[model samples]
Target: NPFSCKTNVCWAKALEPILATAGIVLTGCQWSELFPQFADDKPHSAIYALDVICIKFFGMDLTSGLFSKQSIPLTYHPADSARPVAHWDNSPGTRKYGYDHAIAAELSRRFPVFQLAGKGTQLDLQTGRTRVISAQHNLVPVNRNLPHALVPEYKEKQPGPVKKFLNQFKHHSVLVVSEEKIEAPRKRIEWIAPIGIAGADKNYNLAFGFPPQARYDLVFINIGTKYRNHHFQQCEDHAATLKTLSRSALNCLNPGGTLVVKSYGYADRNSEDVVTALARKFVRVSAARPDCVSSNTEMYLIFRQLDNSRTRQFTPHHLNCVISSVYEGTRDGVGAAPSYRTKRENIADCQEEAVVNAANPLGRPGEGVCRAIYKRWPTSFTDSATETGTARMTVCLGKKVIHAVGPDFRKHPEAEALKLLQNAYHAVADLVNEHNIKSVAIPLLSTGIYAAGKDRLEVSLNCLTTALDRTDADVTIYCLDKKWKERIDAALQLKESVTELKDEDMEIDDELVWIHPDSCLKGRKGFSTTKGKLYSYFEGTKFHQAAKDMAEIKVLFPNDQESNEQLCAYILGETMEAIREKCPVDHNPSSSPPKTLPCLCMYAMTPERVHRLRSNNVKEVTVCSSTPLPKHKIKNVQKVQCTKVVLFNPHTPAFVPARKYI
Candidate 1:
């Protein structure tokens, strides 16, 4: 049993805490059973040395009175445990099953411990199967043979999926991710950390059905999705889905450990949004190709932090929105200004080289936007598959049709409106970058059966403008109704006023205060304020310039529309008190003079308004959307915090659950 110690006392202390945390203890009786084997007739008996290896290297606590039932006194601190690619963005489809693909699929995960006869044949060692025995036709060489010691469990049990899967491998070592438990599981099923990580503890825990550990070093996810509030819609939902992966991915790795994520990607934007989000925090990031080229396009991302030894202070800001009615100035070409026009749209009638389809995530039949594409193409799902698994590829019928899935408003129109703007904007950005499409036309996304809230018609457009300023290609928004177009004109007429807002000299419009709050309206399906007001509108700050101008400090919430919900929910618990206990409040203003205001909700305020409040008094004033808002628009802010729940629903799950409603 290669079981010898480097030292008798302190070295023992180092190993104990790790065992205790993972739940390992050798009781006196338990220790006795294994000690006798080491009994030697030599001058130094193996038994004496075996007993000596314990607290006293002889079963006596050295720091304690001989064998006084040691409480396992702590003499040394616990040390951290030791633990242990990208391409093909635009590859041709005709290259059927390349040799490179199979080699990559096998080599990355192949364990060298079992004997294989061929593709489905294994060297079964019921007793005497020992060498690679390929009797049938063969193509590749096999390495390592599985001996009886490797898989003792295989002989006694009937082979199930796991056993069958293991049998195919050369080794018995494979990590299986399953929600259900196995009948007779082995040591192969363990998730690998906690590093100033804070969460509700042992019992009386606060978030997730289960409490997360204090730290992490490595993690992998298949995006085992929970029933999200957004359901199947990937546009808005992907933000949440990706967030789940990104958060857990970071937590699962050691303080400088490895992180691997296998997630779904349909279209170009999905790949772009996902890679950027997951890799944002990693010191180094890389992407891996899909296992095989199929429509159910799966992607892998790897992340490594510069240092897991400590936590990185994250801070950030609001999305920049540019709103102009098509009724106003219009232009052509890639860099032209954004234009609006109320028109009966068609794939053939649109002037832009490409148009959006408000796509289906799982390729279901028809929607107004997607149906238009279907009428023109008749077979988008079957014909449109581009190895992106979900027809998530950016396919075309002459002019391009990008289907960034935004669900029908009937599902939850208010939330859909917010998600619609964000998704459409991402689709347009993707279209421009991927194909270098000069001009693109997108529908007033949620206007169809998706949203009935006329109040949000303009609001949603404003939400979308969040990225207009940073967009590379010329763009146009197609509104079916002229009324919405003209209303957009009003916001556009006030465009000069908004430009004034982003101005370094601007401050909350001391003269235009009367209508600033009133201009806002109630959402058809939105969460209203104490009286009922939806802060659904946003203006991207010129942070590259403004953060320097506003200076003091800034907060950054680089998440989705539901993004700021984290900062708000960060301190949440069974009660405001519970979360407040865990989440540190900026109670003592006199203590520290921070540079920029720390709270994001507050940080979202205009530079002029930001100038009005004291830095410490500045808590988060608003939740900005990385969400339903585009990333190009959100630069960076300061003094930030985060929390996570359902994608768009940030309400405290109705206090009625605990009857705290006063």
Candidate 2:
């Protein structure tokens, strides 16, 4: 976490939360050598950010024969002297710079097809395009420091890396999977390799499976939930998208490898807990906003999986109602055993007939929650191998250990994932009945990365619950987090009451009348879109709505920082207004403007929106969205996104409450 590091929540010595609840990831041009100081009000449409092109295409440095990341500087000046200042000023720069150079150099050396079309970020010095060539292409050597030339006329000597990359793997079969058409990079380094882009299909028909675990060095995924490209119009389910992409990417990730997923910090209240999921699944992880997308609001969930042996053997549990493995017998079926929340950190008490051990294809506790059991029951795991659908049993803690192999369900999501958990439960229950072990306890099976997608694996929870429900044995299905079952049940019960309630419940003394028009009025120039913040989105569009008869104060797009600032203004508006109205501007009645305009605070909003609110200069309202103060004086007013306050003028009892427009 760029923002959530090892310590200090905001520095006084108090530690910041180890993991941030949510964060954002986005893309921009700040890190590019071409335009390090590019910041305007719109998208910097550079096809791909400079780092994107640099990370893959750029070759190694000339001297060290390797990549380096180090003369990061402040600049508005363009990289190439040939181009004007406006060249880099475009959405993307005129030249791909290193990216284009590497492509052409590879074409000159190896690839006859897209040759950079050949090779392979921070500075052109550090992250710039790097290309090297073989000493001899025409059975002769070339200059080591030949500058890049993108065109035929500007052709220069080939880079050494491209030369070696091309000749070394002469006829390599590159399997680039795509629908519709394939882009073969031939003639760069000059031999053609394959590439695929899924711009065809029923949108998601050909969801290619990635290399499953510990095979690839690095994997990057720009999930459509946050910063969706032109390719994504909308995601049907936000959490589902994260879960789906995460499962696919993880499968391709090798032990000790890394996975970077792009996303907004907080998708919504109901969005998935990406941080906990990543942190629990991978050994070390941090959410951060890259320097390239510094000004934009986004972050990358970087997950670095620990090596097989180091991968922890612990199941993460986040249930409010996890019972102790201590089940003192139930009356019949639906009877809730006088259950006490597990007074333990982990659910692996040595009492139950079976405790679930998370495993891979080879039934060993080499990684994940299974490792914990390995320490306790060193000889517990049986050397069994099973395919995706199947599960096998082993002995742990003198109890039946049901090890289930789970799948990355990009297909038949519910069936496969839940079935895996169910089968594990099936194995444990079958053994308990067969051996007559009496009872078993399982740390909610199939809930980690496998169950983390599109859901918190609550559906998998149902499967676990169901599997246990059918058995006659005394079973204890446990949760790992500090939450309660009763609380969840009560919260779920309360949810039904407000599940569809979208309006602010208000008790107004005066009669409120209907307003003149809807937001979709034909005369309005700017079309409304609910993005960026939580409340701007709505379950249903407003056809025509009325304002509260009271001097209304509300916010459509809720910004907590702005909300806090607005709150300070509301608190200060009356007394601040009382001090202003009582004492005129310049402290002189003759010069002061009437009423000291209704103050407005601005934060967590765009400069454009701030400017829009400022345009309505009717008497004097000023957009403060905060200022100095509120630091010590403001105590608490019940944390809220939007608060409405009515400040009555003490002078005239019947005086109308002027529209304190914001």
Question: Against the unseen true structure, what C-alpha lDDT does each candidate score?
Answer: 0.31, 0.31
- Compared with the true structure, what per-residue lDDT tens digits does model 1 show for residues 415-531? 333544554554445345435455666665555655554445665565445433224345666655667677766665553231111111201110011111212322311122121
- RMSD per candidate (Å) reads 26.2, 26.4
TM-score of every candidate relative to the true structure: 0.28, 0.23
lDDT of 2 by residue, 150-194 (tens): 111211232222222222222333222222232335522111111
Best by TM-score: 1
For model 1, the superposed segments whose C-alpha errors exceed 4 Å read 1-347, 383-393, 407-410, 413-420, 452-455, 489-662
Q: Residue 661 of candidate 2: its Cα lDDT?
A: 7
